[PDB]
Amino acid sequence: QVKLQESGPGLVQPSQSLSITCTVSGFSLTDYGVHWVRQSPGKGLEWLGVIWSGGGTAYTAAFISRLNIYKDNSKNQVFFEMNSLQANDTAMYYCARRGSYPYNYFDVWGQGTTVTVSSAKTTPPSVYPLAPGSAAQTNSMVTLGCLVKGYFPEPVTVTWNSGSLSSGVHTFPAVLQSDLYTLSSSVTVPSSTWPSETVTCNVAHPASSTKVDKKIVPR
Amino acid sequence: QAVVTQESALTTSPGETVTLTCRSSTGAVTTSNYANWVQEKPDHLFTGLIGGNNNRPPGVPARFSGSLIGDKAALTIAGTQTEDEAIYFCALWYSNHWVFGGGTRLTVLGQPKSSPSVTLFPPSSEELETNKATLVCTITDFYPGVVTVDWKVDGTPVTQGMETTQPSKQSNNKYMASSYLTLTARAWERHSSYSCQVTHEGHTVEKSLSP
Ligand SMILES: O=C(O)CN1CCN(CC(=O)O)CCN(CC(=O)O)[C@@H](Cc2ccc([N+](=O)[O-])cc2)CN(CC(=O)O)CC1
Numbered sequence: 001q002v003k004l005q006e007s008g009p010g011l012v013q014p015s016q017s018l019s020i021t022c023t024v025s026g027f028s029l030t031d032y033g034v035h036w037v038r039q040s041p042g043k044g045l046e047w048l049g050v051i052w053s054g055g056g057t058a059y060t061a062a063f064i065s066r067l068n069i070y071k072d073n074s075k076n077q078v079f080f081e082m083n084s085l086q087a088n089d090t091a092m093y094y095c096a097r098r099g100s101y102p103y104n105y106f107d108v109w110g111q112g113t114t115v116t117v118s119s120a121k122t123t124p125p126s127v128y129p130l131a132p133g134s135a136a137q138t139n140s141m142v143t144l145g146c147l148v149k150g151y152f153p154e155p156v157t158v159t160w161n162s163g164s165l166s167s168g169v170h171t172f173p174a175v176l177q178s179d180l181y182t183l184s185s186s187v188t189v190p191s192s193t194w195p196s197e198t199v200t201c202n203v204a205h206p207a208s209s210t211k212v213d214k215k216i217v218p219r
Numbered sequence: 220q221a222v223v224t225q226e227s228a229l230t231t232s233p234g235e236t237v238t239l240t241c242r243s244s245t246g247a248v249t250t251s252n253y254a255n256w257v258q259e260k261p262d263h264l265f266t267g268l269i270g271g272n273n274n275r276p277p278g279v280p281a282r283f284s285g286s287l288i289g290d291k292a293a294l295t296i297a298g299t300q301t302e303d304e305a306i307y308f309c310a311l312w313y314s315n316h317w318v319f320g321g322g323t324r325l326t327v328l329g330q331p332k333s334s335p336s337v338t339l340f341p342p343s344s345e346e347l348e349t350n351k352a353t354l355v356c357t358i359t360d361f362y363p364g365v366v367t368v369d370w371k372v373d374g375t376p377v378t379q380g381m382e383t384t385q386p387s388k389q390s391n392n393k394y395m396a397s398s399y400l401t402l403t404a405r406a407w408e409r410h411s412s413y414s415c416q417v418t419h420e421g422h423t424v425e426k427s428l429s430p
């Protein structure tokens with residue numbers, strides 16, 4: 001029922017700003033407070049600020065002049081706006097809901113906006129279809145793959161047959177091969193389904209707005 | 220501002236009672252600090268566990284209780300379960316701001332053992348047209364999350380080109396990982412046997428390839 005959906009680009013150059021929108025559903029901003037918290041790769045949770053139900057705000061002292069949080073109750077949206085970002089502002093940013101007593105807990109959180117602060121320019125991924133080595137045995141299981149090579153920054157979303165295939169899917173975490181990320185994804189389907197029918201990995205790099213589909217064909 | 224200190228990590232076996240602490244650097248933690256506890260699960264998913272007045276959200280198990288023990292805040296888990304493996308964060312209120320502690324990673328031992336499922340993938344034809352060749356070795360369904368990956372080209376151990384991920388959790392609480400072997404188009408044409416040897420709990424399972 002209750003969700004906080006986040007939308008923010010990701011790539012910010014040093015000394016420039018960050019803007020993230022938290023769109024809520026299943027509750028009203030007139031009844032709940034919305035907090036903003038971040039998590040740096042080498043640290044834990046850092047609380048940044050909050051906009052309470054009444055429109056009142058509070059912030060961590062070091063952030064008063066660089067961070068603002070405001071809202072539009074009618075649009076069910078909370079806006080996070082931070083200026084003068086530096087390299088150590090690179091983190092996953094979250095909006096979290098918190099009610100008044102007896103609902104005074106950080107129950108529901110947004111999935112997070114990945115923010116990377118660097119001078120580096122965006123690099124779209126090169127997506128390669130991974131077909132098996134040997135041929136499949138009559139009536140068996142086959143594992144097809146998708147290599148998502150050399151992209152900057154994080155994240156990337158991989159789906160198979162536009163999200164229709166999920167049960168036999170595994171999407172692996174990335175490696176950092178000299179300032180570029182590479183990850184893989186695989187799907188396991190029966191031999192009666194492939195190459196008889198079409199299996200396609202759909203890769204999206206939101207931080208470059210490229211959407212690529214690569215059909216898996218026999219080697 | 221104030222630093223909130225928590226134990227770095229704790230390790231328990233199922234059914235054990237554990238107490239995680241949350242300490243304030245500026246003095247005693249009191250009810251006016253309204254100590255909250257939040258749980259972080261794999262893939263950066265956060266959920267509230269305990270509220271400002273030691274109240275649990277609907278659906279949070281009764282084994283989780285918040286309290287003040289002397290000068291600090293505490294989270295008692297009365298009978299640790301496998302699903303409680305996570306990172307626990309406390310948050311303290313200081314009149315006009317919240318401060319989160321550094322988090323306590325809880326590891327729960329004695330979970331069912333499972334050997335890895337390995338798959339070795341050959342480089343794409345579309346990749347060889349850019350004169351590059353990457354071999355992917357996917358490691359799936361293993362517990363404990365500790366694995367060593369060794370690569371061989373015709374039986375000869377490889378030096379460079381290899382990069383391996385640190386194991387992370389799957390949807391079924393077991394672990395996954397992947398290992399790459401970035402090579403050149405010409406080096407791929409010369410050698411014939413490629414082996415991805417995955418070592419887990421002293422045992423090795425391997426997948427080979429031949430063009
Ligand atoms: O709530 C808001 O808009 C913002 N609050 C700002 C501060 N709070 C942190 C935060 O909100 O970040 C910490 C204190 N709050 C408990 C909690 O948050 O854990 C409550 C303490 C209280 C005093 C007196 C009575 N009484 O009945 O006299 C009832 C409750 C009071 N806040 C209502 C509520 O939360 O119930 C109102 C103000």
Ligand SMILES: [Cl-]
Pocket residue numbers: none
């Ligand atoms: Cl108050």
Ligand SMILES: [Gd+3]
Pocket residue numbers: 100101104
């Ligand atoms: Gd309050």
